[PDB]
Design an enzyme around this catalytic site. Sequence first.
Site, PDB file in Angstrom:
ATOM      1  N   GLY D  56       0.785  -1.237   0.000  1.00 13.99           N
ATOM      2  CA  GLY D  56       0.000   0.000   0.000  1.00 13.99           C
ATOM      3  C   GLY D  56       0.815   1.285   0.000  1.00 13.99           C
ATOM      4  O   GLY D  56       0.240   2.361   0.144  1.00 13.99           O
ATOM      5  N   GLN D  57       2.119   1.195  -0.139  1.00 12.22           N
ATOM      6  CA  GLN D  57       2.979   2.377  -0.207  1.00 12.22           C
ATOM      7  C   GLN D  57       2.670   3.209  -1.454  1.00 12.22           C
ATOM      8  O   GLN D  57       2.296   2.666  -2.491  1.00 12.22           O
ATOM      9  N   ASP D  58       2.917   4.495  -1.387  1.00 16.06           N
ATOM     10  CA  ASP D  58       2.622   5.437  -2.473  1.00 16.06           C
ATOM     11  C   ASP D  58       3.243   5.025  -3.809  1.00 16.06           C
ATOM     12  O   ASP D  58       2.603   5.113  -4.856  1.00 16.06           O
ATOM     13  N   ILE D  60       3.782   1.987  -4.782  1.00 17.77           N
ATOM     14  CA  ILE D  60       3.198   0.707  -5.213  1.00 17.77           C
ATOM     15  C   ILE D  60       1.748   0.872  -5.679  1.00 17.77           C
ATOM     16  O   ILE D  60       1.292   0.121  -6.543  1.00 17.77           O
ATOM     17  N   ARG D  61       1.020   1.883  -5.175  1.00 19.67           N
ATOM     18  CA  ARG D  61      -0.384   2.123  -5.558  1.00 19.67           C
ATOM     19  C   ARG D  61      -0.623   2.197  -7.076  1.00 19.67           C
ATOM     20  O   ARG D  61      -1.600   1.609  -7.530  1.00 19.67           O
TER      21      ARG D  61
END
Lengths: 591, 16, 243, 167
Positions: D56-58, D60-61
Amino acid sequence: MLTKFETKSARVKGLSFHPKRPWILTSLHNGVIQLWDYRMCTLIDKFDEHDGPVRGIDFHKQQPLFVSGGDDYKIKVWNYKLRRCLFTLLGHLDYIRTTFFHHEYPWILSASDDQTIRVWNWQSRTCVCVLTGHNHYVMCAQFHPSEDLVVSASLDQTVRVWDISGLRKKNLSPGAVESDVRGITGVDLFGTTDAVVKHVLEGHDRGVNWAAFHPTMPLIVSGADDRQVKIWRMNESKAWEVDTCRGHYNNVSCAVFHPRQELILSNSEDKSIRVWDMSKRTGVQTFRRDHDRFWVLAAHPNLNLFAAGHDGGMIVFKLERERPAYAVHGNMLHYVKDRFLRQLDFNSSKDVAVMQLRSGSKFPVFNMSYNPAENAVLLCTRASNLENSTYDLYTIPKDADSQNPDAPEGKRSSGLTAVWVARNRFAVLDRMHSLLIKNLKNEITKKIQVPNCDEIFYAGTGNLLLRDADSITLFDVQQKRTLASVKISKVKYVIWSADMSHVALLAKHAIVICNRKLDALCNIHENIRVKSGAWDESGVFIYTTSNHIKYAVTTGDHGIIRTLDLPIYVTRVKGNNVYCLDRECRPRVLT
Amino acid sequence: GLVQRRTEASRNAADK
Amino acid sequence: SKLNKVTQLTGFSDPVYAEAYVHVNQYDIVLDVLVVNQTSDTLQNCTLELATLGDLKLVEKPSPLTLAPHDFANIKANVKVASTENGIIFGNIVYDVSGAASDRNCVVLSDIHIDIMDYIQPATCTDAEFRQMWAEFEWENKVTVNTNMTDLNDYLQHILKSTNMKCLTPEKALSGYCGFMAANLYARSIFGEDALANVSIEKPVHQGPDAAVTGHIRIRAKSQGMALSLGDKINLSQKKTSL
Amino acid sequence: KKEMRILMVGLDAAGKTTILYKLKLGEIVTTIPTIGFNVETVEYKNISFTVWDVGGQDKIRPLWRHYFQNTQGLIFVVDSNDRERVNEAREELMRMLAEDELRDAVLLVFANKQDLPNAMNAAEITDKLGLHSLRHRNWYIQATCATSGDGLYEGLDWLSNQLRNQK
């Protein structure tokens, strides 16, 4: 060698430093893991769940975890906050020689006598990769500190470099579908495509016990039963032997690069630790023990601390004295950093290199005395043999260009310590423990024979403090008479108040504050080693231990001001600001 | 200041 | 007043202030430690870490606490005494700060010294029994006299008060101003351990009438810890009177 | 056994990986923020759920779009204690729900970390995420504690019943 801490235990097979805490793990041959505080010199905890010798041990860099690997074929992952084993990883068929955590990924690397290297995911508790290709016991395997590389050392006489970049791509790709690879049994006899041998380094005549990467350069060091330490260079397409360090007379158990200097440390079953110059490949220093063989070497990641494990326990040591040579006068700090004399103005915070020091001293500057009247500096350098100690007299150039500091010709001469006594005269303690008064031309003006003098300190114009075994004496250099004496053993530093009304005498574990007549006003005993101190403008003596900033008042009242993560050297105190030098010779201000 | 005494009296007492 | 037993453990400039009430019972030491959060941050897992030196054993490890901003809590810890030895209790307060990358996760406490005098009682024996025990005892601690006291009798009375030992040497054998005095002292611990001391002191006539008392005190005991702890207590008491 | 593909997404530190391994291994895995994805097969009531836990890291979104294809159920995990990032979680959920490839996907929202004293309740999260504004989509919100495992099986039971009735 500056021994900091020493333990007595069963044979130490593994060592790991905690990155932040002053802790060291020791894995013992009797199956016990010990957790030590090397600052307090205390055993914190003991872990004894392994069935026999524990060889592999490593601390996780960020998590409250450590990993151990033993001759019981088990890898145990421990939480040191909970003081419990979290889980055991099973799968090796023989002794586990090394276990290391990856610096970014949730991976454990293990090397075993089963001829395999295994990568484990400690979060999933699964073996992710098996590296096959060594034909003998894999004595060591380490991750590269920044690249997707593994180095391994084996008794097959080879060092292998493995590319694990395939493993990273497979585990980090978010789109890895739910393919029900119930592939329990498919040990593909053909080596798993996820990790490939990049380089095979052949050149040791016997089994290789250890290999390590250089922290920043594409260099590998290896130690083998051939009694040689080899240095290897690699690039993307080739790896080759650079040179061989020769001088061990038994099996080399471990070899590591110095994390901050162009030095290699090796230890051997020959009961010696050797330090090698990486450029000259010559032995710089050799440390011996009389009875105990060395097995493992560890370097602290963030500190100039090394540990060596031997048959009778462990040693924690330093190679060099990290204490910066500095002198404070008014609002100016003069300090030595690398080859440069720097000048810091405390008011403007302007730090400038004022001069370049003469190259070729093997030893760091031990002490510095500044003369503000002649703008001259005495730099004392102590050799390992005290008789070979030297001092350098420099005159600081007035027009210091900060980008290209002048390299003035210093006058080097033999002496234990040199200290300014008057505007145009300095005292030198000679190798014969005689007091020589010299002029600015480095000519002997007066020779004074002083009984039992080990060290000299400044005590105002015309006066010196003479240290003997059990006392400090205030000595008038002109009249050649003792004025006063205070009983204190082994004083290391003398710090006068700005008005010269009070003097703080700093020993290893004691502080005595005296008046100008050397009457003892207070005596403070510290269990922890006293490091530095400075007088505040209010007449409070602020001092540092290894762990605390403390204060002492002339009435004997003392207390803690603040905890220190790292030992700091106080230079000046002004109001709420403590000006200090760290062990890297960086000026810091602490509130 | 701690010393182990090894006198004939201390040996004879320890042996008794 | 409970106030006389309050020991400050940290400074007002520390993120966690701590003070301890030290209650010494016969076989156990109760530490009641007030812990105050002086920060605006919530301190998670705030844990009192105690370590003991000597024959002291921590009975229970203090549980971690969560302290709200400027909140306070009392942490009780019990330390058991197993023998008549000088104990030192060391400690740290360790905490985790939620979200702030504060470099400070540890406050180091002041050392708490346990006094051996709470365990030593004055005892009596015959001169024959004293001489026999004095010959038989395995451990001797030789303390050098270093005091500012100028009277031999005042120094003996000060040692008797500071050690809780009984003088066996009769007052008539101590009487008269000759500049020399020798006395035998005996005590027993609450654990039944015998402690003997011989005081051999002189006034150094060649240094004048204001010369401090000089000499040696020899302490003998069956146990190493008893002889060492009594010797350290005498050395500490002599240094306090030199102020 | 019916095989069902489930995508599990949400912000970083929402506890997605802890939920996945609690369901599979029964244990609490102390997870660092997932810098990738995990794939695990969980069996419940004779349905095999293949759950894709994507980080859910920026950074990876933007990659979540690659996992939308053939997704039958969407699990959105929210940290009910993280009041500051709830609007960010709403925007990211609404952006995912606008994708045509997820049109027929059943939405399960896990209001995770309900064990924390400052946690938003399931009703407050329902309003803040705007779940009542969703038309033509079957959704359910379950209060969950990934550490105790409370509410995880109730959420799976709802998902299993919805996916069984959709054929």
